[PDB]
Design a protein around this ligand. Structure first.
Ligand SMILES: [Ca+2]
Length: 274
């Protein structure tokens, strides 16, 4: 049978899906370690690899497949359920089997995405330092109308230290923090002034390499939740611009506390979709 991860009802992705909007026609590119394209519960329609010696349609890590599953796990009688199960999935490998990648490889992914007409870009990756090349590509995609979502980082908090990584730290990028099934901020969810919105990141069950499913923890899992809500909103009002979709996301979020810890709050797709 098909399992419904707690994450989708928590963010009200089901009320919208129920209304009939599942993110169809929306092109979502997942910049990650690739995707097990042959996964039964997934439907990758294309992409590209910028990692030497590795094809975009294979995931030797499991990370990119899990993230992808959260965005568009097929709505059928098996596996799990994605936020926008009808979204046009694209895998852009910018990380290798060890979860590592170079700035050139990543920006190249951000450039291919925008150039090829992606509506949403998910980056469940992050680093301590940014780069003028990374900033440009990101501001560019956003400038072109591309919604850019990135994991806020998993370095928890310490005193009053802003621990939000890059590219999450960029203004053109939406930073995502993680909360558990009780809607309580996860201990690893980084904090900072740039934290934008919260989504399920603890105990999220999704698709995992070699036709299986696994549970993982991280802000990397919270991100796809927001990347998929964006497509959901886009599949309802396709005329909206990035900044608009973005604003409905944070302007209708459920308040959970100080922005330094929860940003604007937990996202609500039913409210954000008008
Ligand atoms: Ca399924």
């Amino acid at each position: 049978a098909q399992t419904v991860p707690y994450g989708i009802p928590l963010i009200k992705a089901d009320k919208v899906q129920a209304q009939g909007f599942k993110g169809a026609n929306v092109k979502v590119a997942v910049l990650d370690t690739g995707i097990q394209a042959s996964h039964p519960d997934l439907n990758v329609v294309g992409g590209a690899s910028f990692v030497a010696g590795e094809a975009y349609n294979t995931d030797g890590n499991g990370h990119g497949t899990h993230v992808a599953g959260t965005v568009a796990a097929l709505d059928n009688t098996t596996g799990v359920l994605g936020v926008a199960p009808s979204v046009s999935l694209y895998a852009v490998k910018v990380l290798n089997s060890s979860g590592s990648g170079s700035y050139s490889g990543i920006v190249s992914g951000i450039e291919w995405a925008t150039t090829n007409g992606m509506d949403v870009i998910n980056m469940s990756l992050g680093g301590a330092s940014g780069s003028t090349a990374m900033k440009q590509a990101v501001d560019n995609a956003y400038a072109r109308g591309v919604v850019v979502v990135a994991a806020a980082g998993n370095s928890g908090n310490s005193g009053s230290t802003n621990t939000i990584g890059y590219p999450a730290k960029y203004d053109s990028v939406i930073a995502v923090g993680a909360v558990d099934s009780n809607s309580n901020r996860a201990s690893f969810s980084s904090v900072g002034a740039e934290l934008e919105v919260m989504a399920p990141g603890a105990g999220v069950y999704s698709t995992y390499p070699t036709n299986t499913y696994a549970t993982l923890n991280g802000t990397s899992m919270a991100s796809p939740h927001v990347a998929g809500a964006a497509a959901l909103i886009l599949s309802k009002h396709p005329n909206l611009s990035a900044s608009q979709v973005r604003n409905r996301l944070s302007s209708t979020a459920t308040y959970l506390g100080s922005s330094f810890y929860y940003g604007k709050g937990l996202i609500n797709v039913e409210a954000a979709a008008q």
